[PDB]
RNA sequence: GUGGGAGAGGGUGGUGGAAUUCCCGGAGUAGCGGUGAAAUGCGCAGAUACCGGGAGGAACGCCGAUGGCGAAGGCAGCCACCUGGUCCACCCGUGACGCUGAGGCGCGAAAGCGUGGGGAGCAAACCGGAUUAGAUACCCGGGUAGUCCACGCCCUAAACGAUGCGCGCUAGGUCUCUGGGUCUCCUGGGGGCCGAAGCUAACGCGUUAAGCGCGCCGCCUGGGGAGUACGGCCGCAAGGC
């Protein structure tokens, strides 16, 4: 119960799960959701439909705090990013700006064998 | 094929070694803080090579960005 | 580095005649100056091997020029070595 | 004796007395290393492209000077001691390379 | 020699931002992670996701390329210092001072060894979870030496263009890097592609020769046994020649 009425929406989309964190304009979170907060347990979380459900659930939780407009921030390349985008877009929440802010290094650390053949 | 406009052709007389001229080096960066390739800038090999180091200097001085964020995705 | 004034100083000091810029004495004197500069650079920075190779090459060139002088006119050879203090 | 250019970005929140003190220390350090000044361009507070020392702006100073090379690095260190001085970059002077001429 | 030029060539010091990890605080709640699917794992001692601050180690995104430099190995943020090679123009100086090179000497990716330090990420060995007929593997969660630094060793390789070095001669076209010039173009050095003559068993090579010649060094003489044995030399050892 804070009545923020305007904040940010971070989307963390990986190939294994999509998780949505709704925060205030300073970044402090309010509510959140993910594929695991919905009934989906295993690989079904890395599904665009699961991402849609997570986005809609986080949006409905933010409705309790009476929030209307959000600023969307996307991080990570994963199946279900655009589906969460389109879920938040038409959810009653006014989407003011969508921004991709995926953290890309300047070739700092050595990846795992899974991500090798690169630097 | 980058048929919109060349940065050099959309510009006049300028110094390629001036790391303090921010408003002219801003044109040579993309929407992100990244340095534009040759197909976008329309510079020569030597020109682009000098531009790279001058942009890096302008970045270290705090004038140009190392990286920006993408909007309207 | 090795500026132009020092180079002209050693050239005029070792020139066989006014205008000589490429006699054997001048070449050996210039190589000796470069060799001493590089040796002073290599006392410190002893982990610099790529310049050590250039030092080896300069020494070889100077030895070959001194060998030529030894064969042709040993008097100017002894005079050069006496002026520069080489061969120990 | 080579020609160099010194860029100094310092705290934009300094008052005139503190700024005068920092510039006085800069001039004294330049004299202490024999850096003959040829010109100066005080640009002052300008908007940075990223926060430096948690501050979105910085006060810029530029000095074209001539000094012995052997101590150039040894001078830059002396200019980084002041906490108000947050960026020091020395660059060998180069002739302008014009493009699209 | 003089005057210019390009460069991740090398060494030393300093310095910048992104990211990973960790620590502190805020905010916040039931999972995160991971896979073909899972489980170990981590999470109510509050994780993951988000914001801010701090520490540390390592590597430099875009530029960036079929590009550049180096004798090879190899070299990629930025700044300064020290320093090597190289190219061009002038036609100035020396006057065959040249080429190659058994030995010798020096350099020599990675891994490995010694002493000291460092240790974020990764990760042999190893500890587990899976898979499987079994799985001393691939897949997943951890993880030590190591990777990093200083100094000293080690001398190996698909150390590759699988093509020793130098010089001369023998159609061109096209792309490119870098100079010079009467700057449509010409000329010089380097990096590619296609091709005259010619060569090759063929594939292919073809002014960057694998063509035509000359000089000098290295090496080959059927396969296995075998880069093994013995001997010698070198190495702390692994081991190398
Ligand atoms: K290359
Ligand atoms: K240890
Ligand atoms: K030209
Ligand atoms: Mg999953
Ligand atoms: Mg300071
Ligand atoms: Mg270099
Ligand atoms: Mg915490
Ligand atoms: Mg875990
Ligand atoms: Mg753990
Ligand atoms: Mg448990
Ligand atoms: Mg509880
Ligand atoms: Mg974390
Ligand atoms: Mg943080
Ligand atoms: Mg630590
Ligand atoms: Mg690239
Ligand atoms: Mg080369
Ligand atoms: Mg190689
Ligand atoms: Mg002549
Ligand atoms: Mg004559
Ligand atoms: Mg030879
Ligand atoms: Mg030999
Ligand atoms: Mg080695
Ligand atoms: Mg090693
Ligand atoms: Mg060790
Ligand atoms: Mg140790
Ligand atoms: Mg690991
Ligand atoms: Mg593992
Ligand atoms: Mg196992
Ligand atoms: Mg089976
Ligand atoms: Mg079983
Ligand atoms: Mg650990
Ligand atoms: Mg050990
Ligand atoms: Mg090869
Ligand atoms: Mg070979
Ligand atoms: Mg063979
Ligand atoms: Mg050849
Ligand atoms: Mg050519
Ligand atoms: Mg061909
Ligand atoms: Mg034919
Ligand atoms: Mg044929
Ligand atoms: Mg040939
Ligand atoms: Mg045999
Ligand atoms: Mg036999
Ligand atoms: Mg055999
Ligand atoms: Mg063997
Ligand atoms: Mg053996
Ligand atoms: Mg034996
Ligand atoms: Mg022994
Ligand atoms: Mg063994
Ligand atoms: Mg063994």
Task: Enumerate the domain spans of chain B.
Answer: 1-73
Measured CA to CA, the distance from residue D45 to residue D48 in angstroms comes to: 9
Provide the CATH number for the domain around residue D34. Answer: 3.30.70.60
Of D4, D98, D1, D5, which is closest to residue D60 (Cα–Cα)? D5
Give bridge partners of residue D42 from the DSSP assignment: D61
- A43 φ/ψ angles, rounded to the nearest 5 degrees: -75, -15
Interface residue B60 vs chain D (CB under 8 A): yes
Residue A108 in tokens:
């700092």
Interface residue B63 vs chain D (CB under 8 A): yes
Give partners of C (≥3 CB pairs < 8 A).
none
- Å from the A60 CA to the E201 C1': 79
- D98 in the Ramachandran plot: left (φ > 0), alpha (ψ -120 to 50) or beta? beta
Q: Which run of H or E residues covers position D18?
A: helix D16-32
**Cα of B73 to nearest chain D Cα, Å:** 22
**Cα of A57 to nearest chain B Cα, Å:** 22
Resolution in A: 3.3
Residues of B in contact with D7 (CB under 8 A): 20, 61
Give the HSE-up count for residue C51: Cα atoms under 13 Å, Cβ half-sphere: 15
- Sole residue written with tokens 């309010």: A30
Q: Which run of H or E residues covers position A13?
A: strand A6-13
Residues of B in contact with D50 (CB under 8 A): 62, 65-66
Q: Which run of H or E residues covers position D72?
A: helix D72-80
Interface residue D45 vs chain B (CB under 8 A): no
Interface residue B56 vs chain D (CB under 8 A): no
Q: Which run of H or E residues covers position B52?
A: helix B45-60
**Cα of D101 to nearest chain B Cα, Å:** 6
* Interface size, chain A vs chain B, as Cβ–Cβ contacts under 8 Å: 16
Measured CA to CA, the distance from residue D33 to residue D72 in angstroms comes to: 8
Residues of D in contact with B12 (CB under 8 A): 100
Residue D27 in tokens:
């001039």
Task: Please give the nucleotide, over all strands, whose C1' is closest to the CA of residue A20.
Answer: E49
Q: What are C9-13's contacts with CB under 8 Å, separation 24+?
A: none
With CB atoms and an 8 Å threshold, state whether B73 touches A99: yes
C-alpha separations of C24 from A62, C16, C30, C45, C68 in Å: 89, 9, 10, 31, 9
Q: CA C76, C77, C81, C84: dihedral to nearest 10 degrees?
A: 50
Name the experimental technique.
X-ray
Sheet containing A6-13, strands listed edge to edge, beginning at the edge strand earlier in sequence:
A29-34, A18-23, A6-13, A69-75, A94-100, B70-71
Residue A42 in tokens:
């295993």
Contact D38, B54 (CB under 8 A): no
Task: Enumerate the domain spans of chain A.
Answer: 1-119
Give the one of B17, B20, B63 whose C-beta lies nearest to D97's C-beta: B17
Mutate to test the interface with D, among B5, B29, B52, B62 (most CBs of D within 10 A): B62
Measured CA to CA, the distance from residue D44 to residue D62 in angstroms comes to: 10
Taking CA–CA distances from A85, the nearest residue in chain B reads: B73
Cβ-Cβ contacts under 8 Å for A57 (sequence gap 6 or more): A33, A37, A38
- Sole residue written with tokens 């650390």: A109
Task: Please give the nucleotide, over all strands, whose C1' is closest to the CA of residue A27.
Answer: E51
Task: Tell me which architecture the domain covering A1-119 has in CATH.
Answer: 2-Layer Sandwich (3.30)
Number of structural domains found in chain D = 1
- Kindly write down the DSSP assignment for every residue of C21-51, as one continuous string: -SSHHHHHHHHHHHHHHHHHHHHSSTT-HHH
Residue D44 in tokens:
């002052």
Domain that holds residue D8: 1-101
Residue C68 in tokens:
């030529």
Cα A97 to chain centroid distance, Å, stands at: 14
Q: Which run of H or E residues covers position D25?
A: helix D16-32
- Å from the A97 CA to the E62 C1': 25
**Cα of B13 to nearest chain A Cα, Å:** 33
């Amino acid at each position: 119960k804070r009545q923020v009425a305007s904040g940010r929406a971070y989307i963390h989309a990986s190939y294994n799960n999509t998780i949505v964190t709704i925060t205030d304009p300073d970044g402090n979170p309010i509510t959140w959701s993910s594929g695991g907060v919905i009934g989906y347990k295993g690989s079904r979380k890395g599904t665009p439909y699961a991402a849609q459900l997570a986005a809609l659930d986080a949006a409905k939780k933010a409705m309790a705090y009476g929030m209307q407009s959000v600023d969307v921030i996307v991080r990570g390349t994963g199946a279900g990013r655009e589906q969460a985008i389109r879920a938040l877009q038409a959810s009653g929440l006014q989407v003011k700006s969508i921004v991709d802010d995926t953290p890309v290094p300047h070739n700092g650390c050595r990846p795992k064998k899974k991500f090798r053949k690169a630097s | 094929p980058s048929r919109k406009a060349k940065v050099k052709a959309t510009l006049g007389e300028f110094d390629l070694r001036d790391y303090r001229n921010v408003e002219v080096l801003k044109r040579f960066l993309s929407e992100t803080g990244k340095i534009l390739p040759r197909r976008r800038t329309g510079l020569s090999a030597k020109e682009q090579r000098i531009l790279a180091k001058t942009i890096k200097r302008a970045r270290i001085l705090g004038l140009l960005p190392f990286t920006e964020k993408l909007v309207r995705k | 580095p090795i500026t132009k004034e020092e180079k002209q100083k050693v050239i005029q000091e070792f020139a066989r005649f006014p205008g000589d810029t490429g006699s054997t004495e001048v070449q050996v004197a210039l190589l000796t100056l470069r060799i001493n500069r590089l040796s002073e650079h290599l006392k410190v920075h002893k982990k610099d091997h790529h310049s050590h190779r250039g030092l080896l090459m300069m020494v070889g060139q100077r030895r070959r020029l001194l060998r030529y002088l030894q064969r042709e006119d040993p008097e100017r050879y002894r005079a050069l070595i006496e002026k520069l203090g080489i061969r120990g | 004796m080579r020609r160099y250019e010194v860029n100094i970005v310092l705290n934009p929140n300094l008052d005139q007395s503190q700024l005068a003190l920092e510039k006085e220390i800069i001039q004294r350090a330049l004299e202490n290393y024999g850096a003959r000044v040829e010109k100066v361009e005080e640009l002052g507070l300008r908007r940075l492209a990223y926060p430096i020392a948690k501050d979105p702006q910085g006060y810029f100073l530029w000095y074209q000077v001539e000094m012995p090379e052997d101590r150039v690095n040894d001078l830059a260190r002396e200019l980084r001691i002041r906490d108000n001085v947050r960026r020091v970059m020395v660059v060998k002077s180069q002739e302008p390379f014009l493009a699209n001429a």
